[PDB]
């Protein structure tokens, strides 16, 4: 069988996409097993529970196996031993990264806000009906990725596809299911600082400099008030533990549609150079900022070249 698998530190898109593409492949006689490279966030765990699904199989070694990649095309986000596997498919909505194959494959890549939007196109192409349970987690993955359409990564294709999936899943109020997800993401009390920093954390090599960026998306930025000092202490620790130039944590308020960024950097004027807004006691408010890959990373990469 093939293993359908998303990126290291799986998000809803990577997990819901794996289940959604595995089902499709099994229905068209191309045997497939959903898999993951890490634990589910409470967000993803809630989505699976609500629509009645088991987590994909936890699997880290793929040497000698067939692999269908979801929601990236990067070596670093792939399984450690991806070079010893055979990539038979990629479905994604990112820039084309450094993954390569020695064998013919499928690529379904589109400039949209969510892999699950593309996977919906795959069902239509194959003329396989989307079961109500699958439609719902597919829906939720797109609301997760596009932040209920508020993220500037949201495209026309994502909106029309959610509207389509909502009817198939018999969800009347897709926006209420979206807010239900971000409420679960907003329940941060009692969670160790490190679990929160690493929930959605990525390392970047920006012109020789190692820059780590976490992000939490919540309904109200006030939930972080009592734990914020523990966060600032833990991003200092983590900067040392990895010998990082910079560790930044995005606290993203999806109602104000902005991000408070906690900063520890070897560069004192980092946020002044990249965004034209300086940090004040290792903190800066970034109005309108929702997306790491669109509004945060480009401007940092530009400042490490300059
Ligand atoms: Ca390539
Ligand atoms: Mn993702
Ligand atoms: Mn995605």
Numbering used by the authors: 2 to 307
From the primary publication:
The crystal structure of Mn-Sh-PPase in the absence of substrate was determined at 2.2 Å resolution. The M1 and M2 sites showed similar coordination spheres to other family II PPases. The M1 site in Mn-Sh-PPase was coordinated with one nitrogen of histidine, two oxygens of aspartates (D12 and D72), and a bridged water. Additionally, the M1 site was bound with an extra water molecule. Coordination geometry of the M2 site in Mn-Sh-PPase was also similar with that of Bs-PPase and Sg-PPase with 5-coordinated bipyramidal geometry. However, the distances of a bridged water in the Sh-PPase from M1 and M2 (3.0 and 2.4 Å, respectively) were considerably longer compared with crystal structures of other di-Mn enzymes. In addition to the Mn-O distance, the Mn-Mn distance of Sh-PPase was also longer than arginase and catalase. A unique structural feature of Mn-Sh-PPase found in the present X-ray analysis is the longer distance between bridged water and two Mn atoms compared with that in other family II PPases. Our observations reveal that the di-Mn centre of Mn-Sh-PPase in both single crystal and solution forms has longer distance with bridged water. This suggests that the active site of Mn-Sh-PPase has an intrinsically ‘loose’ structure.
Inorganic pyrophosphatase (PPase) catalyses the hydrolysis reaction of inorganic pyrophosphate (PPi) to two inorganic phosphates (Pi) and plays an essential role for living organisms. We previously reported the expression and purification of family II PPase from the psychrophilic Shewanella sp. AS-11 (Sh-PPase) isolated from shellfish living in the Southern Ocean (Antarctic Ocean). Sh-PPase activated by Mn2+ ions (Mn-Sh-PPase) displayed the highest activity at 5 °C, which is characteristic of cold-adapted enzymes. X-ray crystallography and EPR spectroscopy were used to investigate a cold-adapted family II Sh-PPase from a psychrophilic bacterium that lives in the Southern Ocean.
